[PDB]
Amino acid sequence: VLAAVIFIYFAALSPAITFG
């Protein structure tokens, strides 16, 4: 389950890092 949590963390850093 730890692997899955890290996958969603990166998915949230895509739209959070972009300035659009």
UniProtKB/Swiss-Prot annotation:
It is found in: Cell membrane; Basolateral cell membrane. The chain crosses the membrane at residues 1-20. N-glycosylated. Detected in erythrocytes (at protein level). Belongs to the anion exchanger (TC 2.A.31) family. Functions both as a transporter that mediates electroneutral anion exchange across the cell membrane and as a structural protein. Component of the ankyrin-1 complex of the erythrocyte membrane; required for normal flexibility and stability of the erythrocyte membrane and for normal erythrocyte shape via the interactions of its cytoplasmic domain with cytoskeletal proteins, glycolytic enzymes, and hemoglobin. Functions as a transporter that mediates the 1:1 exchange of inorganic anions across the erythrocyte membrane. It is linked to Ovalocytosis, Southeast Asian: An autosomal dominant hematologic disorder characterized by ovalocytic erythrocytes that are rigid and exhibit reduced expression of many erythrocyte antigens. Clinical manifestations include mild hemolysis, intermittent jaundice and gallstones. However, the disorder is most often asymptomatic. A dimer in solution, but in its membrane environment, it exists primarily as a mixture of dimers and tetramers and spans the membrane asymmetrically. Component of the ankyrin-1 complex in the erythrocyte, composed of ANK1, RHCE, RHAG, SLC4A1, EPB42, GYPA, GYPB and AQP1. Interacts with STOM; this interaction positively regulates SLC4A1 activity. Interacts with GYPA; a GYPA monomer is bound at each end of the SLC4A1 dimer forming a heterotetramer. Three SLC4A1 dimers (Band 3-I, Band 3-II and Band 3-III) participates in the ankyrin-1 complex. (Microbial infection) Interacts (via N-terminus) with P.falciparum (isolate K1) aldolase FBPA; the interaction inhibits FBPA catalytic activity. This is Band 3 anion transport protein. It comes from Homo sapiens.
